[PDB]
Amino acid sequence: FTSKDTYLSHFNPRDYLEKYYKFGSRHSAESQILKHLLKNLFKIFCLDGVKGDLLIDIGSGPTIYQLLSACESFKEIVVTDYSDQNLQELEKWLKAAPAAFDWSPVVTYVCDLEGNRVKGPEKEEKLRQAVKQVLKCDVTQSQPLGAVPLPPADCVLSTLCLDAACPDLPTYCRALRNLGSLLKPGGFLVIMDALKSSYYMIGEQKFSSLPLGREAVEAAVKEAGYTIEWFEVISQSYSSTMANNEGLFSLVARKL
Template identity: 55%
Template sequence: MRQPHQTTPSINLSSSVLKPVKGPSLHFLSPGTGILHFKPDGVKGNTLIRIGAGPTVFELLSACESFKEIIVTNHTDLSCQEMQKWLKKEPGAFDWTPVVKYVCELEGDRKKWAEKEEKLRRTVKQVLECDVTKFNPVTFASLPPADCLLLSQYLGAICKDLSTYRAALKNVSSLLKPGGHLLMVITMKCSHFVIDQNKFPCLFLEKECLEEAVKEAGFDILAFEVTPICYPSSLIEHEGISYLVASKGKGKED
């Protein structure tokens, strides 16, 4: 199994394009950053679990307005440590301020960035290590079933083949209550990505394969949108970013 490269997260907002993609439950804003904006009358609830994606917060900045608590999981202990640094305002924590201000601007009030940071810190209740390819449900035994699962740019980087991808998706589906929502941000037809001049392989995903995997895991797809290519080809070979909204079928057992 491939291990994702550990590095300090960075965001280049100047290369982002504000191009909303509307779905039945939320808007996806600024595809180049993976920033999500939840509609006030859309996906919401008590608990959101963010699966993987490293020690980042940009995909959670809007979610903290729609969920009472957020549980963050990361693939490695190092990512968990980095996340805790930011949550606890420890020295050396990554400065997400420019991203927070940008999200607040998208939401209508850039001046509320400090309030947004503090609200997210209060809303994140736990940070857990979780390798979805070696899923241990005991780790989550004390957690209530989630209202929403968020997977952003993660499974394709750590799953070596489609069978592993399907199994991982089924594993995490057990954390979601029937009728709950799955939100996914996926790099489509990606062969590799580059970090610090090092090339890392990525699982090549096409729309049909992804839809099949989601349905096999017990979900009903509500929306599937694809944006144009938004990352530089020097960093990643791909054919666009997809945004998927699905619901876990009621009455379907894990």
């Protein structure tokens, strides 16, 4: 199973962004999936009452898509990833470097969902202002953020990280439990991940994925000290050239 070190040495941020996050007019398997992610995080952060002071984004990677709706609902967003190269691609965009991956097609989409109330530039600035901290992360450590002092967060968020980072269920259950120590009692856990997947490709590079189904995930969540507000499962898959998932699940949980 892909080790931590192989995320430091082989995970290619720009490569990954190109492969998965170039909102393309040709209706790819990747595009449709992004569209669906975007719609859930909208429903969760805008339509529903999931809001608060502090959100912690677990396993951010180089990507900002999952923070776009959340920035409407939280004052303070911290972003975390295990890999230094990854945090460096984020910061590019945070700094609005002209070398930063181009997100406007995604920003366009979200602004639409929220009924065009704002424009790309004013959506972007909101996120920029919202992100206070960019930190090293390890979901396997009982203190994932290590030393860094943080108040208890209202919400922990994780998109397609926990599958990537957890070799087994024991460890997967440990990770959730670790995230929970950053969360208030009654705090929000929002996870979105692949169902029944063993690998995913960034270019030529193959990264492991923990193949778990609907049941195992829900079980792991209860064990870690959470109750599930809601749990969703969609058929849509990635291109066969890229991963072997059967679908995706989204959930909102609450800590005890």
